[PDB]
From Swiss-Prot:
Signal peptide coordinates: none
Annotated compartments: Host cytoplasm
Region span, Disordered: 1-113
Domain of life of the native organism: Viruses
Protein name per Swiss-Prot or TrEMBL: Host translation inhibitor nsp1
Domain CoV Nsp1 globular: 2-113
Organism of derivation: Severe acute respiratory syndrome coronavirus 2 (2019-nCoV)
Function recorded in the entry: Inhibits host translation by associating with the open head conformation of the 40S subunit. The C-terminus binds to and obstructs ribosomal mRNA entry tunnel. Thereby inhibits antiviral response triggered by innate immunity or interferons. The nsp1-40S ribosome complex further induces an endonucleolytic cleavage near the 5'UTR of host mRNAs, targeting them for degradation. This inhibits the integrated stress response (ISR) in the infected cell by preventing EIF2S1/eIF2-alpha phosphorylation upstream of stress granule formation and depletes host G3BP1.
């Protein structure tokens, strides 16, 4: 399927144990997509002071369209030293590995895969 319904655990930035997916734009997009498939991906909502507490390159989920079955359609955009790789809509948050942190909420998304 071109899209997959996922329910992403929303994590507090200070709880996150593994603060990024790797060391290059290509690696972080690769690893984010693998963790999304494996159900091992969390979401951190972006506010003042969040991104400097995480590791670059960043992987964002961004709204790709204006919401089947409650699931917002999203795609992945990576960022490294102020350059983004991809073009999409509003940020829903930054993706991180999930390794058992307790979430505060779930974000229903339809991921363009």
């Amino acid at each position: 399927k071109t899209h997959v319904q996922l329910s992403l655990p929303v994590l507090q930035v200070r709880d996150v144990l593994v603060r990024g997916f790797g060391d290059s734009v290509e690696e972080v997009l690769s690893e984010a997509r693998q963790h999304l498939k494996d159900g091992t991906c969390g979401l951190v909502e972006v506010e003042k002071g969040v991104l400097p507490q995480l590791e670059q390159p960043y992987v964002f989920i961004k709204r790709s369209d204006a919401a089947p079955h409650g699931h917002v359609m999203v795609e992945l955009v990576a960022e490294l030293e102020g350059i983004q790789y991809g073009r999409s809509g509003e940020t829903l948050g930054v993706l991180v590995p999930h390794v058992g942190e307790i979430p505060v909420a779930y974000r229903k998304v339809l991921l363009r895969k």
